[PDB]
Amino acid sequence: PLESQYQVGPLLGSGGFGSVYSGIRVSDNLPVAIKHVEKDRISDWGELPNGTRVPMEVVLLKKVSSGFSGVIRLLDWFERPDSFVLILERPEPVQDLFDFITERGALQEELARSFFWQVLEAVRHCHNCGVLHRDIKDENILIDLNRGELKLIDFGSGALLKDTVYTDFDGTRVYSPPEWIRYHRYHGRSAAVWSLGILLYDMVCGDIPFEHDEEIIGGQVFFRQRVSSECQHLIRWCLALRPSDRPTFEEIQNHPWMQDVLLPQETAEIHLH
């Protein structure tokens, strides 16, 4: 029974994360986030390793739930007549990266480097576990302000990672790649790299570069803030119009701009405390 294992608290973020409520596990007072998803609104379904029919979001969350602090951990889930309930870990204190950038403006490159590196490691963990997130954006990244650790959240648009072409997409359009805009076709890794270029521009410029379809497909990146030549080069490479011209994750992490990253604790002490 859900209501016996958890003391349920008020809505978190006034619905901005979805139907997510504060909670505490009665077993050990562990803080949790309790996310509700309506069966009627769930598009993609999968099966757990035993065979039970569950939302794809649960399948993907279970696949990445092993120990790496870079992705949000699913602690348990429950099925109800009309919905599924997901028990997620709740780091505290947190602020999501969208609100962080709004309040602080364009981030210093040392801080952007630390955040971007952690996002790359978290996305690599997903792919290593057979999961494609498909909605990487600052709104879906939580910052643990005390530990300087970032958490990727919201697998509600994700899919099993495959090497063949994707013809469906329900993530965020302004982070989606031009081959999706133009042809409704994309491959998972190179589309992820495009969204990471959007995210990195967002961090060092204070907002995303493109709002309209014509900007996404046009191939021009204007820098509205002072950004180093090395960082500009990485962003423009991630935002190559043709997917085969984009870097691999290995090439991103070996890029000159990515060298000498801060540790998470160093990041918190220099930039967050």
Partner: peptide
């Protein structure tokens, strides 16, 4: 200053 906003996925 420019207009920065969230974008729904869904």
């Amino acid at each position: 200053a420019r207009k920065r906003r969230r974008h729904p996925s869904g």
